[PDB]
Design a protein around this ligand. Structure first.
Ligand SMILES: Nc1nc2c(ncn2[C@@H]2O[C@H](COP(=O)(O)OP(=O)(O)NP(=O)(O)O)[C@@H](O)[C@H]2O)c(=O)[nH]1
Ligand SMILES: [Ca+2]
Ligand SMILES: [Mg+2]
Ligand SMILES: [Mg+2]
Length: 166
C-alpha cells in the first residue's frame, strides 16, 4: 500500500500536536507539552485506497530549529499550521513555507495551509488574509479546531490528495 510522509510544521503552541493526536487518537490534548520531534503512523482508507499515513510532529520552539533541514529534506507533504488567534504565527508560517521551498529547491512542494483554533472567538487572522497567502502558493486553505475536531480530517486528507496531484 502507498505510504504518505506528512510533516506538521508551524510556530510554538499553534496546535500541531493537538491536531495530530486528534487525527490519530481521537481525543483533545488540553495541556501544553512542547514537542521535540514525534512520529505517528496509521493505516486509513482515503478515496477507496488503503494507505499508511506517516506523520511527523515537529517542534515550534525556535531552540530546535536546527532539526528543520533534516525533516524538510525527507517530508513529502507539509501541513503548515498557524493559529487564528496568533498573528505572529501567521507571519511565521509564511517563513516556514519559504524555508521548505528553499530546502527542497522546488516551487511545487505539496502543502496545505491550516488556520487552527477556529473554535476561539479571539480571531486576529481573518480567513481572507490566509486565503490570499495560500493562493500565492497555489495551495488550499482549511480552518480547523483540534478541540472540536472541525476540519481535522479534511486538512490531513486534503494534504494526502495534494501529494497525489504531484
Ligand atoms: N481552543 C483550542 N485550543 C487548542 C487547539 N489546538 C491546540 N490547542 C491548545 O493549545 C495548546 C498548544 O497545543 P499544542 O498542540 O501543544 O501546540 P504545538 O503546536 O504542538 N506546540 P509545540 O510547537 O511547542 O510542540 C494546548 O493547550 C492545546 O490544548 C484548538 O484547536 N483550539
Ligand atoms: Ca504535561
Ligand atoms: Mg507539539
Ligand atoms: Mg488585522
Amino acid at each position: 500500500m502507498t505510504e504518505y510522509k506528512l510533516v506538521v510544521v508551524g510556530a510554538g503552541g499553534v496546535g500541531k500536536s493537538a491536531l495530530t493526536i486528534q487525527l490519530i487518537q481521537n481525543h483533545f490534548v488540553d495541556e501544553y507539552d512542547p514537542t521535540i520531534e514525534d512520529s505517528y503512523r496509521k493505516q486509513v482508507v482515503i478515496d477507496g485506497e488503503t494507505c499508511l499515513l506517516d506523520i511527523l510532529d515537529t517542534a515550534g520552539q525556535e531552540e530546535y530549529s536546527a532539526m528543520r533541514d533534516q525533516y524538510m529534506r525527507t517530508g513529502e507533504g507539509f501541513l503548515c499550521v498557524f493559529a487564528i488567534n496568533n498573528t505572529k504565527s501567521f507571519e511565521d508560517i509564511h517563513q516556514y513555507m519559504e524555508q521548505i521551498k528553499r530546502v527542497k529547491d522546488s516551487d511545487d512542494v505539496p502543502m496545505v495551509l491550516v488556520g487552527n483554533k477556529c473554535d476561539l472567538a479571539a480571531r486576529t487572522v481573518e480567513s481572507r488574509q490566509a486565503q490570499d497567502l495560500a493562493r500565492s502558493y497555489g495551495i488550499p486553505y482549511i480552518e480547523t479546531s483540534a478541540k472540536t475536531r472541525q476540519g481535522v480530517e479534511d486538512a490531513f486528507y486534503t494534504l494526502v490528495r495534494e501529494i497525489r496531484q504531484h
